Design a protein around this ligand. Structure first.
Ligand code: QOM
Ligand code: ANP
Ligand code: ANP
Ligand code: MG
Lengths: 278, 308
């Protein structure tokens, strides 16, 4: 059991507001710390089966983080089985809904600067040994220039959320690297998948593609089709040839989506690649 | 088509019963029993009218404006009627879920029938092939729609001896709007569809062939059983899918089944869909001609293995 009085941020009160979406990781409520915050409500059936021990470990790790491109992790109180994760609230639009708005005007300069900010944030996390499982355009926020990363390290938690057949979305598959898709099998939980620093730079490639094409690489297929296409690597080979964008642009997209994970660059390397660009 | 006179009879008897209700609401229905989980489908009692129907429940939280478009596309399904297509009664929106109420087929699905029988004999599978072929031709010729999801769990039977197709792909908007699809342990998708290239009804023909092998042998045939396992008669999803794309297709054992039956499935499971038989070629295959002229009391076999 850890409470809100152990945190860097002076805590006195916190009022829940309207919810703003449900997912397989509890419910997220717009809150008010004198500043608005995001409150994620969880339930853990794991009756002290090292789940809480792991939760205490990971949450304390989040405490030692602060960066202008990453959400400000504020507090995490656990009165088991009910847990809560409080994050700074990002105003503005998600990068998902931002790039798909017709009125939005992105250019080769705006696209470069946005990616740099994301790499800077993702670089900080990797430097701290924090693997950002679940990186995608829905978990990145833009507000007239300011770019923030959201919901990092959330998949390391083993809370309750369902049957035998696997439960997958399409927006998620486009960010999943082949090493992960191959290991997917029924009765297997998200914690068992091989997320890594390489899995994050792969998902950054799908983000980089979204910055160019304003859509995801694979037209909405049956999930089974999307599995083999990604797990075989053939799918990313077709979409890379199917439309050209630019040798410099396609260079880093072919780099991040490399099938052999060790051929994927680090984020510090990606900062330089984004420099030598139009 | 090639409509029989009696098929008109049972069609019309359904279409007389159609008008026996006008509107639908949640409280019209009383849960009789649970059928299976997928959406979930329940045997239900309709109270405004004595008809017993099957109500399948698909849970979705999405906005009203898109919903009226899905439903108006879905109303076209009241138009298709065939002795090989489960009858449809209506669609509505209620309490966070679209309910589809349709004809109740008292024998269930071929998966649950196979579970009870152990294996399905060759002669029954001949009658099933004709019904499937004619259903797909009907959908192609009259409404220009492919099924897209043919498999044993979606082939229903009754004690009258009718065989009907369900769960086909009528709404383009509904496919795209469903963000979250569900994968399981068995896949019946054809190779060409899995690689994301152009596809047609040919992919349904593969699905029929593969479904037939499962039911003929009593086991999902990927991966193939070993030598000693066919006598007696833990894999990740990507391993299965890559088997379908790269390894030779499954085939029937050469001892216990006729050449017409073996050749038929082989023509269905050719991986290149341009060489795979089409509906016109299938309609004229020796296997179908033999089955069509055979006298098999299908009702009696079904009732006796399922215990009425
Ligand atoms: C990405 C992708 O490929 N999606 C996809 C691919 C193929 C199929 C479906 N699809 C589906 O799977 N079902 C099954 C799960 C119950 C449907 O019922 C279903 C459906 N209803 C329905 C219609 C008629 C009768 I007679 C019974 C019914 F139930 N209509 C109207 C559809 O238009 C679709 C498109 C359905 C979805
Ligand atoms: N710090 C935040 N500021 C603003 N909105 C947030 C924040 N964190 C999460 N959200 C929103 O809360 C909602 C629920 O988030 P989430 O549970 O991650 O669902 P998701 O990201 O859309 N996909 P999933 O994680 O699988 O449920 C989404 O609409 C997010 O955009
Ligand atoms: N119209 C129906 N009448 C009677 N039983 C039905 C009907 N539809 C489904 N069932 C039964 O309910 C079970 C579950 O079917 P279903 O929900 O369709 O799962 P599924 O077909 O395997 N997946 P999907 O094809 O996407 O729906 C079937 O195996 C049948 O036994
Ligand atoms: Mg999120």
């Amino acid at each position: 059991s850890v409470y809100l009085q152990e945190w860097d941020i002076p805590f006195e009160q916190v009022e829940l507001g309207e919810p703003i979406g449900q997912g397989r990781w509890g419910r997220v409520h717009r809150g008010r710390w004198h500043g608005e915050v995001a409150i994620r409500l969880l339930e853990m059936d794991g009756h002290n089966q090292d789940h809480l021990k792991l939760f205490k470990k990971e949450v304390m790790n989040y405490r030692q983080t602060r960066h202008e491109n990453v959400v400000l992790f504020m507090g995490a109180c656990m009165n088991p089985p009910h847990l809560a994760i409080i994050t700074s609230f990002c105003k503005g639009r998600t990068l998902h809904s931002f790039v798909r708005d017709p009125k939005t005007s992105l250019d080769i300069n705006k696209t470069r600067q946005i990616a740099q900010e994301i790499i800077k944030g993702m670089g900080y996390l990797h430097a701290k040994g924090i693997v950002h499982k679940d990186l995608k355009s829905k978990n990145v926020f833009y507000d007239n220039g300011k770019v923030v990363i959201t919901d990092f390290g959330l998949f390391g938690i083993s809370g309750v959320v369902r049957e035998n057949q696997l439960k997958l979305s399409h927006d998620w598959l486009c960010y999943l690297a082949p090493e992960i898709v191959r290991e997917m099998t029924p009765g297997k939980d998200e914690d068992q998948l091989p997320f890594s620093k390489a899995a994050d730079v792969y998902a950054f490639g799908t983000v980089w593609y979204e910055l160019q094409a304003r859509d995801w690489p694979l037209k909405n297929q049956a999930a089974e089709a999307s599995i083999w296409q990604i797990g075989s690597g053939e799918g990313m080979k077709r979409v890379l040839t199917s439309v050209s964008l630019g040798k410099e642009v396609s260079e880093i997209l072919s780099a991040c989506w490399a099938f052999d994970l060790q051929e994927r660059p680090s984020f510090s390397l990606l900062m330089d690649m984004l420099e030598k660009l139009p | 088509l090639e409509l029989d006179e009696q098929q008109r009879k049972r069609l019309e008897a359904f279409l007389t019963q159609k008008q026996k209700v006008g509107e639908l609401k949640d409280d019209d229905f009383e849960k009789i029993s649970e059928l299976g989980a997928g959406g979930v489908v329940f045997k239900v009692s309709h109270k405004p009218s004595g008809l017993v129907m099957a109500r399948k429940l698909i849970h979705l939280e999405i906005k009203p404006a898109i919903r009226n478009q899905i439903i108006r596309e879905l109303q076209v399904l009241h138009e298709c009627n065939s002795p090989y297509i489960v009858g449809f009664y209506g669609a509505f929106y209620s309490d966070g879920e679209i309910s589809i109420c349709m004809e109740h087929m008292d024998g269930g699905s071929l998966d649950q029938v196979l579970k009870k029988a152990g294996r399905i004999p060759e002669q029954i599978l001949g009658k099933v092939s004709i019904a499937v072929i004619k259903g797909l031709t009907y959908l192609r010729e009259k409404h220009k729609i492919m099924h897209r999801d043919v498999k044993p769990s979606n082939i229903l039977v009754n004690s009258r001896g009718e065989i009907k197709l369900c769960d086909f792909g009528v709404s383009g908007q509904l496919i795209d709007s469903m963000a979250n699809s569900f994968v399981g342990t068995r896949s019946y998708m054809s190779p060409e569809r899995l690689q994301g290239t152009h596809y047609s009804v040919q992919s349904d023909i593969w699905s029929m062939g593969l479904s037939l092998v499962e039911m003929a042998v009593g086991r999902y045939p990927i991966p193939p059983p070993d030598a000693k396992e066919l006598e007696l008669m833990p894999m990740a999803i990507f391993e299965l899918l890559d088997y379908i794309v790269n390894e030779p297709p499954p085939k029937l054992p050469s001892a216990v089944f006729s050449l017409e039956f073996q050749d038929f499935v082989n023509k269905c499971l050719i991986k290149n869909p341009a060489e795979r038989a089409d509906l016109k070629q299938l309609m004229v295959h020796a296997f179908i001609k033999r089955s069509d002229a055979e006298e098999v009391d299908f009702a009696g076999w079904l009732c006796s293995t399922i215990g009425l």
